[PDB]
Design a protein around this nucleic acid. Structure first.
Ligand SMILES: [Mg+2]
Ligand SMILES: [Mg+2]
Ligand SMILES: [Mg+2]
Ligand SMILES: [Mg+2]
Ligand SMILES: [Mg+2]
Ligand SMILES: [Mg+2]
Ligand SMILES: [Mg+2]
Ligand SMILES: [Mg+2]
Ligand SMILES: [Mg+2]
Lengths: 124, 144, 79, 112, 60, 97, 185
RNA sequence: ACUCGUGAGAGACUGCCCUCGGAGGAAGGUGGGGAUGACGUCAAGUCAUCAUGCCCCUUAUGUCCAGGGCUUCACACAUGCUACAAUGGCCGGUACAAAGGGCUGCGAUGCCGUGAGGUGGAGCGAAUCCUAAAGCCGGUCUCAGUUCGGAUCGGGGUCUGCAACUCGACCCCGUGAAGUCGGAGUCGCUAGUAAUCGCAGAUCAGCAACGCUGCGGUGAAUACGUUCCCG
RNA sequence: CUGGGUUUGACAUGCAGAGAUGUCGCAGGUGGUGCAUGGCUGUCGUC
């Protein structure tokens, strides 16, 4: 089958596609119950809704690492890769929409002399 | 900033309006979006129900009555033509600050009532744009 | 707060056991600051070390729960 | 509405109403109103006069409501001050008692 | 830190508390790493000189 | 009837010498074993000030203990004699289990 | 501060521990054991500890200085383990880093002047891609200290691939001590 | 198989239209951060990490031991936590981290207790065993020095330790002090950064730790510009 | 710092008492001088 990675901010996702009616499940739970949030709802479905496939595919998914905004954003890139393995007609749409980029955003190291990463202490 | 302009941040639009996501961030403190957003959805959909009877344009028409076209600066006071996008930053940011100043119990209600006063033009947010235009256009001499 | 039991240092309490024979007499030198006042002691003197000199300390029934070191203040501020 | 001690809170919930009494704070008021008893969301106005006297009789005997309690804290200090314990050497010159550093910021005891 | 107070740390302490752990080479009380059993300063003499196996700079 | 050869050592290249040396000794008696399997590397970290009065300066000092697990499936009297005897790793720990 | 130890700086790439033994529970003790040995006991000294066994390998320019078998028995008491001692030679003690510093240590201690004594080391050892040598502090019994250096060829300190052999010794005069430093690429 | 741990590798150089923009690629034209500190300044810090020239102490300024003291206190400055409230407090539900540490050690279920704890020892020298909060849905308080705040003080306790009076902190109960965004003036920060929220470690019986050094959660605002000050 | 002991000095070449300690079963010195010095850092400046 189609099995696809996705990562964000150290939040390691799995995805797998089967064709069927419009739902998807997250370790034996609904989308609405895992993310009670309107912002994270559209952001997962963005590669589905932009291309207008939407109700074609199931997703079963496993969720490790990170947090709610990390794992929600990680599903987007997981799906964005996965819809190309259906057919590479979607790739030129999905690239210009801007979903195939993972974030090279990651948390910077806390440095000696400084309390958070960049932030120095008080002076003189 | 000395060497050249850095690139501006991209900004994602349930409503699908540029202004509401810009309002979310101006409301936001402590870096938590959800309590910032639920106060916006509290105030915006209160103004939907009671008075104005559409969601977005009640804010957008009120936002025109905050927006200044002109601002004052000191060279060391020279008035300056404000950019199209900088006018919207002052529009949101004033509207949020006077909601924090207001006496009403909760910011669902304070931010709601501020938008209604901005629709009329009796509010403290709309009071400020007159004062900036007063201080701008009373000068003019210094502009060269 | 010694959870279970009180503390007296064993060299102190032997001198108090000698006073039982006399029923307590005079003032006995004491270099252990660290001992409790067990109600065997009540109505007795001892000369307790200040880290400098020995201060005379009479005992009463009010001073039972308190430790022996509490009645000789080690540093002086008049000003 | 007497409150037993004397003062009557000006209405509101009952759970917190008892904290204005000197003997009682939050946890002992939870213990009273559980046993005696009447719910937390009941208010001080909507108690009947005999329902106040059920609170009176139970806690009057058990704890120090005010004056008895008020004198006992002062009377323990009065002996301890002259008791000769170092702990009440510190009372006689208005300094902190429980082994704090008095070099910077002991302004609760000392004052402005 | 002297010679005499070093041999205090080697002796039997009488009570199990008083064993306070001097540095082996440094003979310094403060900042002696457990396991290494070395002075913090001494650690930099040893670790730069390639003396402690498995210990090396650094970040990251 | 399963023997487990646990390795621990500092240098990651030096274990790759020994991990081959376990294979050749056991594959004399022929086949069997899992092969080597990577296993995660621990990291103790120690921050030290660079003699007196300059706190902001600092170094850091890692030490890495690389580990291998191996797992021999087949015990045999010919194997266990040859396993310990001819195999000699230099400055690397081996714990049979 | 200025110039980290280039021996320690290239530990991952090309330096290799003088002590090459592993432990966990015995690890505090084996460091304390090696501190006793290197105080007691020269170009370089390596050790390869194993249970009940130590190599204690030595590099020296003049190997001959029977007596080593007594020094084994001196180390035998402190270690309490089977000492299998080896003394080795090294090719080019002229080119070795600590032995150049020990060469200059003899010169300054015997009241040879420093600009004479330094020039020998840089000229001879180059006769390697480049050399830098530096003697520091209290030179010829002057009141104020100074540090001067000499060099020939090229010595790139920041290049990690470049193997620099570093050495140090405190040569002890009538007036104090001079710290010699030798970088050889 | 998909992760994930390592071990080999490939992949970015304006290379295809100064620079504006192109096509892919996971990535752009210093991709992100560290490690690195030239020749030298300041007679910059340390004789208290350790060495050491000279001078001094040698019958003590050396050397054990209990005792105190380094924790005082009219004040003054500095660095930092907790706060001044509804983007809240209390309280019931329900859930997402990755770095770590563990042999005189880390300590599970179980029963005792209001609780810090006691009891007892499963398992374990380790990807096996032991070790999130803010959030979201509800409820409740109503702009009050309060159900904000958690200082100070009085009784009692637990735990290591020979011993917690001088001086350990832990949590139960009474008390509820100043404080209503802060004068002149001042610093920190250009993106996973500021701001906020936890978790672990080193030293360590015990802990004055709100410090220090690391990790991950949520996550903004603005950089028109170079005259204006500072280097 | 007040004491209680000790003298080539702790290092190399059970009953008494606060307790160390009893009585029976040349070394050394956190000691002066960082403007005598080495080594090791801070800094101007990652300029
Ligand atoms: Mg952070
Ligand atoms: Mg470079
Ligand atoms: Mg000076
Ligand atoms: Mg201090
Ligand atoms: Mg004073
Ligand atoms: Mg809760
Ligand atoms: Mg601790
Ligand atoms: Mg000296
Ligand atoms: Mg100097």
């Amino acid at each position: 089958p189609i099995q696809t990675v996705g990562r964000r901010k150290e939040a390691v996702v799995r995805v797998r596609l089967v064709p069927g009616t419009g739902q998807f499940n997250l370790d034996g739970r609904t989308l609405e119950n895992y993310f009670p949030n309107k912002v994270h709802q559209q952001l997962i479905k963005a590669p589905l809704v932009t291309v207008d496939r939407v109700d074609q595919f199931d997703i079963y998914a496993h969720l490790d690492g990170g947090g709610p905004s990390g794992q929600a954003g990680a599903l987007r890139l997981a799906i964005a890769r996965a819809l190309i393995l259906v057919q590479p007609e979607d790739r030129p749409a999905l690239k210009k929409a801007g979903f195939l980029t993972r974030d090279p955003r990651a948390i910077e190291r806390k440095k000696y002399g400084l309390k958070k990463a960049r932030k120095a202490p008080q002076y003189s | 900033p000395r060497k050249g302009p850095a690139p501006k941040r991209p900004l994602v639009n349930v409503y699908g309006s540029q202004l509401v996501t810009q309002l979310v961030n101006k409301v936001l403190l402590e870096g938590k979006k959800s309590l910032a957003e639920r106060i916006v959805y509290g105030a915006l959909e209160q103004a939907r129900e009671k008075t104005g009877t559409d969601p977005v344009v009640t804010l957008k028409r009120a936002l025109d009555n905050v927006k200044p076209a002109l601002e004052v600066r000191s060279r060391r006071q020279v008035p300056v033509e404000v950019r199209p996008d900088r006018s919207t930053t002052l529009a949101l940011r004033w509207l949020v600050n006077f909601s924090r100043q207001r006496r009403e119990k909760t910011m669902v209600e304070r931010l709601a009532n501020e938008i209604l006063d901005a629709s009329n033009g009796l509010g403290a947010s709309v009071k400020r744009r007159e004062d900036t235009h007063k201080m701008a256009e009373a000068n003019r001499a210094f502009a060269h | 707060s010694l959870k279970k039991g009180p503390f007296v240092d064993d060299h102190l309490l032997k001198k108090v056991d000698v006073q039982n024979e006399k029923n307590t007499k005079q003032v006995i030198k004491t270099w252990s600051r660290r001992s409790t006042i067990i109600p065997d002691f009540i109505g007795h003197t001892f000369a307790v070390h200040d880290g400098r000199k020995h201060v005379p300390v009479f005992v009463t029934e009010a001073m039972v729960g308190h430790k022996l070191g509490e009645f000789a203040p080690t540093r002086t501020f008049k000003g | 509405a007497r409150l037993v001690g004397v003062d009557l809170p000006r209405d509101k919930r009952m759970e917190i109403a008892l904290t204005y009494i000197y003997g009682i704070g939050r946890t002992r008021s939870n213990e009273i109103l559980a046993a005696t008893g009447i719910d937390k969301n009941m208010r001080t106005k909507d108690l009947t006069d005999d329902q106040v006297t059920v609170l009176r009789d139970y806690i009057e005997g058990n704890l120090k409501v005010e004056g008895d309690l008020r004198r006992e804290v002062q009377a323990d200090i009065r002996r301890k001050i002259e008791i000769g314990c170092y702990q009440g050497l510190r009372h006689r010159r208005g300094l902190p008692v429980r082994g704090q550093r008095t070099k910077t910021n002991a302004r609760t005891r000392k004052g402005p | 830190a002297k010679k005499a107070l070093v041999h205090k740390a080697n002796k039997k302490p009488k009570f199990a508390v008083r064993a306070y752990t001097r540095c082996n080479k440094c003979g310094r009380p403060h900042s002696v790493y457990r396991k290494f059993g070395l002075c913090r300063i001494c650690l930099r003499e040893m670790a730069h000189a390639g003396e402690l196996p498995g210990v090396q700079k650094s970040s990251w | 009837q399963k023997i487990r050869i646990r390795l621990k050592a500092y240098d990651h290249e030096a274990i790759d010498a020994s991990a081959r040396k376990i294979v050749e000794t056991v594959t004399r008696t022929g086949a069997s074993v899992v092969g080597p399997v990577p296993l995660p590397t621990e990291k103790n970290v120690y921050c030290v000030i660079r003699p007196h009065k300059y706190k902001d300066s600092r170094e850091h000092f890692e030490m890495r203990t690389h580990k291998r697990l191996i797992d021999i499936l087949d015990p045999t009297p010919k194997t266990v004699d040859a396993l310990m005897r001819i195999d000699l790793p230099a400055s690397v720990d081996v714990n049979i289990q | 501060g200025q110039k980290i130890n280039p021996h320690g700086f290239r530990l991952g790439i090309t330096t290799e521990w003088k002590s090459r033994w592993y432990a966990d529970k015995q690890y505090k003790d084996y460091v304390k054991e090696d501190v006793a040995i290197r105080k007691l006991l020269i170009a370089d000294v390596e050790i390869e500890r194993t249970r009940d066994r130590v190599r204690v390998d030595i590099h020296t320019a003049r190997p001959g200085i029977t007596e080593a078998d007594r020094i084994r028995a001196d180390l035998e008491k402190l270690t309490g383990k089977q000492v299998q001692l080896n003394i080795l030679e090294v090719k080019n003690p002229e080119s070795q880093a600590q032995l150049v510093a020990q060469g200059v240590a003899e010169q300054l201690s015997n009241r040879v002047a420093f600009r004479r004594a330094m020039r020998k080391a840089i000229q001879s050892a180059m006769r390697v891609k480049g050399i830098r040598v530096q003697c520091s502090g209290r030179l010829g019994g002057a009141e104020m200290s100074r540090s001067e250096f000499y060099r020939e060829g090229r010595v790139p300190l920041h290049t990690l691939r470049a193997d620099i052999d570093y050495g140090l010794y405190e040569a002890k005069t009538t007036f104090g001590r001079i710290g010699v430093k030798v970088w050889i690429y």
